[PDB]
Design a protein around this ligand. Structure first.
Ligand SMILES: N=C(N)NOCC[C@H](N)C(=O)O
Ligand SMILES: O=C(O)CCC(=O)C(=O)O
Ligand SMILES: [Mn+2]
Length: 348
């Protein structure tokens, strides 16, 4: 039985906010996840996004597959196209990253992963953008509360999320039709927070913290978390519950907290019916470097955009986006922009 919290609309640092942050941390440390109650507008926007997803997925495959870009990873992923731990995953997905036109300087400069969302239509665009703006408000509340719970300055995490690389995976899992029940293999997500919504069908499992269990640092190429613990208990079923979003930490929170919080491993099983879900990623700015909060002498850093780019290249080795990154050596640009960017997102 997960804990469910109502968040205040604004987080100011009062005693109630600090107390709530303590409780959020404790729930992550015990269960790996908690639920936040949605209000009528949060719920309406969730349901409108789910409905737009259902209508898009009914479109012909050739049309859905045309919603792709060789500049951004935004757009369609066919069932069986994504790889997790060397094995295909079976949802169809529409990924929404920051929507930047070719008029944006970062796109003109050829920054990896920067480009315009290949929206299927302008009603889908509006529904997803409205939903993601509401999700972002919740992400910022959660980050202020988490800072307060760790006795950190309230803006510790939000200072990294200005123009943050927030993105969302809009998912449809097919019903199980073969002997394979794997929807998505075990993995961890990459940023600060994951805020997710699901329909009534069910299929998400999460792994709580386990005393003494070593957790891979998925930001390191030699410690991918993909596939880890896939067939080992414990796995907690996330029971579909009306009127909530779930929240769990991503890789950046594990790193910054030195493992006081863990990036929650999770996986999806196919069910007897198709299943719609949306997973939202509240992320640092592409140019931000995460750092250990509790070890100021530690020199390790995570360049968030580098982590995102590495992850999406491993997910989609043959996608046109990945091919163009390799063909234009855009990973080298990524090293260049670390030192010669003009955006002012970081540095003097
Ligand atoms: N893309 C995200 N956030 N999740 O998808 C599943 C994990 C991904 N294929 C991986 O190998 O990490
Ligand atoms: O299907 C879900 O509920 C979550 C999916 C997920 O974790 C992801 O797409 O990364
Ligand atoms: Mn995930």
């Amino acid at each position: 039985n997960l804990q469910t919290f109502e968040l205040p609309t604004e987080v100011t640092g009062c005693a109630a906010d600090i107390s709530l942050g303590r409780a959020l941390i404790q729930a992550w440390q015990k269960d790996g996840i908690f639920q936040i109650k949605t209000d009528s507008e949060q719920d309406r926007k969730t349901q409108e996004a789910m409905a737009a997803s259902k209508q898009f997925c009914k479109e012909p495959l050739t049309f859905k597959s045309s919603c792709v870009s060789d500049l951004t990873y935004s757009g369609y992923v066919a069932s069986g196209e994504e790889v997790t731990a060397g094995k295909p995953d079976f949802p169809e997905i529409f990924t929404v990253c920051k929507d930047l036109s070719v008029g944006d300087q970062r796109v003109k400069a050829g920054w990896p992963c920067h480009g315009p969302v290949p929206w299927p239509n302008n009603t889908y665009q509006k529904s997803m953008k409205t939903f993601m703006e509401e999700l972002g408000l919740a992400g910022e509340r959660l980050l202020k509360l988490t800072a307060l719970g760790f006795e950190l300055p309230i803006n510790t995490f939000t200072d990294l999320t200005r123009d943050g690389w927030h993105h969302m995976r809009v998912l449809r899992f097919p019903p199980q039709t073969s002997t394979l029940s794997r929807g998505i293999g075990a993995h961890t997500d990459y940023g600060l927070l994951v805020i997710a919504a699901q329909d009534d069908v069910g299929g998400l499992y999460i792994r709580p913290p386990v005393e003494g269990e070593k957790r891979n640092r998925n930001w390191l190429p030699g410690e991918s978390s993909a596939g880890m613990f896939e067939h080992d208990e414990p796995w907690t079923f996330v029971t579909p519950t009306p009127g909530v979003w779930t929240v769990f930490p991503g890789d950046i929170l594990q790193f910054m907290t030195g493992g006081q919080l863990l990036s929650t491993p999770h996986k999806v099983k196919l069910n007897t019916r198709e299943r719609f879900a949306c997973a939202y990623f509240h992320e640092p700015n592409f140019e931000a470097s995460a750092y250990p909060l509790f070890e100021p002498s530690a020199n390790e850093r995570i360049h968030y955009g580098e982590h995102f780019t590495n992850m999406f290249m491993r997910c989609y080795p043959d996608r046109i986006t990945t091919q163009r990154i390799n063909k234009e050596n855009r990973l080298a640009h990524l090293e260049d922009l670390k030192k010669y960017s003009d955006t002012r997102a970081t540095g003097s």
